[PDB]
Amino acid sequence: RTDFDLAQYLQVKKGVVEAALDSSLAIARPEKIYEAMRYSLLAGGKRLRPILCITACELCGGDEALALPTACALEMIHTMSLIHDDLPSMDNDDFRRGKPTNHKVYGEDIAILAGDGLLAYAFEYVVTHTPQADPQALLQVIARLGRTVGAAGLVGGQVLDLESEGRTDITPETLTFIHTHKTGALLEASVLTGAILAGATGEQQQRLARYAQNIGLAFQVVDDILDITAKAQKATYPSLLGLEASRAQAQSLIDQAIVALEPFGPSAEPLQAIAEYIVA
Amino acid sequence: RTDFDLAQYLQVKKGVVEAALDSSLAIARPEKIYEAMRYSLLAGGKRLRPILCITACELCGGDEALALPTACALEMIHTMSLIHDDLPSMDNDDFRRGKPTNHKVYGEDIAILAGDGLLAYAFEYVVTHTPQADPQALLQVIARLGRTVGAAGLVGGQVLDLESEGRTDITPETLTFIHTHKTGALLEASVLTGAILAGATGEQQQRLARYAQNIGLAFQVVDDILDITAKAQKATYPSLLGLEASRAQAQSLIDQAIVALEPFGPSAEPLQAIAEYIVA
């Protein structure tokens, strides 16, 4: 094969990642916590975040071997956030991607604990499996991951989302504020941890952060568009802006994400193709 | 003052720690997650783990400035484990150290998320606030903390404890297995992260790990002794061994913890005094 095909590029990275994730949890005593963690971690899905991490690392002159442990850690973090999000105390989903939810399968106590275990393991895994990284770079990755997950990132976003339920004062700005924390921080971490591992400059990181923020929002706008075209109220992009402006804003976010990476040269084409996919 | 007094030694370290913890969480948007985290982190208590970390770091030729960020991270981890332990899905305690429990005060959703935030912040805080550490040492601390919290440590211990409820086959060995994960891993991490920061040898670390494991078990034996002298059934040390053997085993654990540190010379006296306290 001589030409770039996104579907096949992703297929190959998804396989490498799902093999690494499988490897990463050898069942030990107590077997149940490993069964519960494996249930959610190996449940499949797009594996976008690890793939973004590997992709951004390669973009910046790193390789898959350097990025794969961080890539896994990002998926462990993503999975923990899903396990916790599904809980009766939160969304109370009985199903996820056509499969029953962790707490329905093992109980709420085990689900809460499998989430905690995956978050812990993320940090252990990055350090124990990346001895070839520059130590100052790995520590910057650890700092970034801790910042991404907590009050200033993902957990901050979950609280901002809870605070939005049954309110009549949500604006496009406050909805964007929710999404930039809830999902944007982890997408940004996914491309910036890859770049940081490869030794990327502050200037290169700022472009990747713009890309990541814009693809994150674009995903959430398109999602809202698909919802409205297909529990207290919650305002969405189309409910606040109308469908015409929602659609133009999604296109414009994807355009700015693609332009943001143009100065990396053709090495950026895979990340640009991921952005285009969101609006195809 | 010319002589060592444990009560005053602890008072001084507890003050430095509670000031650092207070400092570590400046309220920002969304204020609620910072209020919820601060509620549990600043609720007081013995601050044993941070104090052990600072103490073991000083024992090994480090200082309080080197250890304080890790010391805080250990208390953040401890607090997260308490917030999660108290949840309706777990122990369902409405109170803790005479104060209402995080989920009663903010809700289960916020409590779950404040726990996640504190666990995340632990890792961020260690890296961002310890630039003077040797980078390979800090990464070993991060690895140790991730390993301590997860399936092989604290979360493993919580699952082993859940698995013990209403069983008739618990032995002193299986009760010890629960406690070495549930509390022993984090006490061990508390003295080993301090020692690792100060550049301690593998040989010195092994003595500190023996000390930490023995003071951890001694605490749990004495606790069971005090319970039985003062929900499905749960076997305890006195219910399995009798009170005479329980008491001899607590004394013997404390003796082995003190002997384990004798080869450090008099620098070990503070850690030895902490051990003696457990049985006084």
Ligand SMILES: C=C(C)CCOP(=O)(O)OP(=O)(O)O
């Ligand atoms: C923080 C994250 C990404 C957890 C899932 O958030 P959502 O609430 O958007 O997910 P669904 O329940 O809609 O699947």
Ligand SMILES: C=C(C)CCOP(=O)(O)OP(=O)(O)O
């Ligand atoms: C893992 C830890 C240390 C959480 C508290 O455990 P416990 O179940 O022993 O604590 P209490 O509810 O008895 O306070």
Ligand SMILES: [Cl-]
């Ligand atoms: Cl460039």
Ligand SMILES: [Cl-]
């Ligand atoms: Cl020595």
Ligand SMILES: [Mg+2]
């Ligand atoms: Mg949800």
Ligand SMILES: [Mg+2]
């Ligand atoms: Mg959900």
Ligand SMILES: [Mg+2]
């Ligand atoms: Mg939406």
Ligand SMILES: [Mg+2]
């Ligand atoms: Mg181009």
Ligand SMILES: [Mg+2]
């Ligand atoms: Mg308990």
Ligand SMILES: [Mg+2]
């Ligand atoms: Mg409890």
Ligand SMILES: [Mg+2]
């Ligand atoms: Mg007990």
Ligand SMILES: [Mg+2]
């Ligand atoms: Mg002595």
